[PDB]
Paper text:
Subclass B3 PBP (known as [name] in [name] and encoded by the [name] gene) is active during cell division and localizes to a multiprotein complex termed the divisome, where it functions in PG synthesis in concert with the division-specific glycosyltransferase FtsW. [name] consists of three major domains: the N-terminal transmembrane helix anchors the protein in the cell membrane, while the C-terminal transpeptidase domain (TPd) is the catalytic module of [name] and mediates cross-linking of PG chains by ω-peptide linkages between d-Ala and meso-diaminopimelic acid (m-DAP) residues on opposing peptide chains. The catalytic serine acting as a nucleophile in the transpeptidation mechanism is also able to react with β-lactam antibiotics because of their structural similarity with the d-Ala-d-Ala motif; the resulting covalent intermediate, however, has a very long half-life (with turn-over constant k3 ~ 10−4 M−1s−1 or less), effectively leading to irreversible inactivation. AiCuris previously reported on the development of a novel monobactam ([name]), which shows remarkable inhibitory activity against PBPs of Gram-negative bacteria, and good antibacterial activity, even against clinical isolates harboring several β-lactamase classes.
To simplify handling, [name] from [name] was produced as a soluble version in which the N-terminal 48 residues, including the transmembrane helix, were removed (EcPBP3ΔTM). Apo-EcPBP3ΔTM was readily crystallized, but crystals yielded weak and anisotropic diffraction data extending to a maximum resolution of 4 Å, which prevented determination of its three-dimensional structure. We reasoned that the N-terminal part of the protein comprising the n-PBd may prevent formation of a highly ordered crystal lattice because of its flexibility. The EcPBP3ΔTM and EcTPd* proteins were crystallized after pre-incubation with the experimental β-lactam [name]. To understand the effects of structural optimization leading to the final [name] compound, the environment of the five functional groups addressed during the process was analyzed in the crystal structures of EcTPd* and EcPBP3ΔTM complexes. Since there were only negligible differences between the two models (RMS distance: 0.37 Å for 336 equivalent Cα positions), we will focus on the binding of [name] to EcTPd* because (i) electron density was clearly more informative in this structure, and (ii) despite differences in crystallization conditions, the complex has been crystallized in the same space group as the apo form, minimizing spurious differences caused by non-conserved lattice contacts. Our crystallographic investigation revealed a considerably higher flexibility of EcPBP3 when compared with its P. aeruginosa orthologue, particularly in the extended N-terminal portions of the head and anchor subdomains.
Residue numbers in the entry: 62 to 203, 228 to 570
The structure:
């Protein structure tokens, strides 16, 4: 006869290098056998029995009422996480029913730096959120196992240090950032702000406990424009040397206007100035299924398959009929909703020059055989085109790193509101790859609703990119690609 459901230790979570991210700490817990007292021990008062309740700081009247609450049970928790020096005194009191049992509570050395991804456990050491829940059966002993994540705590800590201070400085509602290795699909960083300290889950609002990298969905905005140009090159609408007439016009009665008045722009200049008129005239010159297909090939609308709780696949339009105004707006954001993790996998394919690799939060044994979803030559051309964004004249010139070549694309989305209409709050986007000569990392920096002054990604989310991606290349010892080194 067994009256105990779980009575064993649990595993340990580390990063890809072996640094502790989630360690079990052994703690003693006082329990009692209520059937032992009533059947043969006999419920008594006075003696040292009263001092036993006086040591637990529980009144002897109600402590005796909790054990006597059921004369048939064989287990009852008197206290939790008792220290050894005082628990050894309770065992030395020789109680005819009280026993000691070695349990374990969790400690996370990263703390709030990896909180949304690591997660936590309940008082009985059962995973609830994040990696703790997704790999509970693996970590739980009954068959104890360890686990090594794909996160690099060196890069993870520097992404949080800049993303957390960016949300605070701009007084933004939220802020997410995802870093993924280009040619392996391994998630290196995954930070959110504001966060919580999983070592103490007291008064932490559940609104700040959601993994916004996989939960929040937003219209990607201008960040999908590289795929608009990449599709326009394969469909033969234009060539790399084409010049588009970017004069504002009206599709289906609604005005299509750029950020500024540009009479004509280069194909490279469209991604530079983020011309909605340029991408709209390209989308209208193609079948509507072209952009719907290419977006899917890069992972949009598809599941990320990480196994994390609350992981959304985003809203993706499957319409069979498209209005000309809906085809044009679909080129620069309107129409679909994707998580920051899905947007990172898009640029994880852009960096791979058209290779779609699955996302994994565990250390992968190389090599990772992906699947070529787009011609390598076209992506190489557009990736070099995206470098103009981080050069004088582009939108993400504030994201430029001193001594490196990067290819990025800024964005600014209008938040759809509670009643379905667009609000005056914006989503600042900045996503790109680096090094531009040989891509190795893909980064996405998205912050929710800036209120400090500016709101577009090129002025709010872009300087976060250059500060983060700057530290990523220094830590990984990547050779500079700048003309002036
Ligand atoms: C790309 O996503 C695209 N934005 C949109 O199409 C969407 N909304 O656009 C809103 C306007 O956003 C902006 C307005 C003005 C500026 C700006 N002042 N630019 C600076 C001028 C000075 C020199 N540096 C540049 C920036 C953004 C709106 O319509 O109110 C949209 C798409 S999907 C969705 N839900 N909303 C642009 C505006 C091209 N991205 O611009 S950005 O600079 O790359 O961030």
């Amino acid at each position: 006869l067994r009256v105990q459901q779980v009575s064993t230790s649990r595993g340990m979570i580390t990063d890809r290098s072996g640094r502790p991210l989630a360690v079990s700490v052994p703690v003693k817990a006082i329990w009692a056998d209520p059937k032992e007292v009533h059947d043969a021990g006999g419920i008594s008062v006075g003696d040292r029995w009263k001092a036993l309740a006086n040591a637990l700081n529980i009144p002897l009247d109600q402590l005796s009422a909790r054990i006597n609450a059921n004369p048939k049970g064989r287990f009852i928790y008197l206290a939790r996480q008792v220290n050894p020096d005082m628990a050894d005194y309770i065992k030395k009191l020789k109680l005819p029913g009280i026993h000691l049992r070695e349990e374990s509570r969790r400690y996370y050395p990263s703390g709030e730096v990896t909180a949304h991804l690591i997660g936590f456990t309940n008082v009985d050491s059962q995973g609830i959120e994040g990696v703790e829940k997704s790999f509970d059966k693996w970590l739980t002993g009954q068959a104890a196992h360890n686990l090594a994540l794909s996160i690099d705590e060196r890069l993870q800590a520097l992404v949080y240090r800049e993303l957390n201070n960016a949300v605070a400085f701009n007084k933004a509602e939220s802020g997410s950032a995802v870093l993924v290795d280009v040619n392996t699909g391994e998630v290196l960083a995954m930070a959110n702000s504001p966060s919580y300290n999983p070592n103490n889950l007291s008064g932490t609002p559940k609104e700040a406990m959601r993994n916004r990298t996989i939960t929040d969905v937003f219209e990607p905005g201008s960040t999908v424009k590289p795929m608009v140009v990449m599709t326009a090159l394969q469909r033969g609408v234009v060539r790399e040397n084409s010049v588009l007439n970017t004069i504002p016009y009206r599709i289906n009665g609604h005005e299509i206007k750029d950020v500024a008045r540009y009479s004509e722009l280069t194909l490279t200049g469209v991604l530079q100035k983020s011309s909605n008129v340029g991408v709209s005239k390209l989308a209208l010159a193609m079948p509507s299924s072209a952009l719907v297909d290419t977006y899917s090939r890069f992972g949009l609308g598809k599941a990320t398959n990480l196994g994390l709780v609350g992981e959304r696949s985003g809203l993706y339009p499957q319409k069979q009929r498209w209005s000309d105004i809906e085809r044009a707006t679909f080129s620069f954001g309107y129409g679909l909703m994707v998580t920051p993790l899905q947007l990172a996998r898009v640029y994880a394919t852009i960096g791979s020059y058209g290779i779609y690799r699955p996302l994994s939060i565990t250390k992968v044994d190389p090599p990772v055989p992906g699947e070529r979803v787009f011609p390598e030559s076209i992506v190489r051309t557009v990736v070099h085109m995206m470098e103009s964004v981080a050069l004088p004249g582009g939108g993400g010139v504030k994201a430029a790193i001193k001594g490196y070549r990067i290819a990025i694309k800024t964005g600014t989305a209008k938040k759809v509101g509670p009643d379905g209409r667009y609000i005056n709050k914006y989503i600042a986007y900045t996503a790109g790859v680096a090094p531009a000569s040989q891509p190795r990392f893909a980064l996405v920096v998205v912050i929710n609703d800036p209120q400090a002054g500016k709101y577009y990604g090129g002025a709010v989310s872009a300087p976060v990119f250059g500060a983060i991606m700057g530290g990523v290349l220094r830590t990984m010892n990547i050779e500079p690609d700048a003309l002036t080194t």
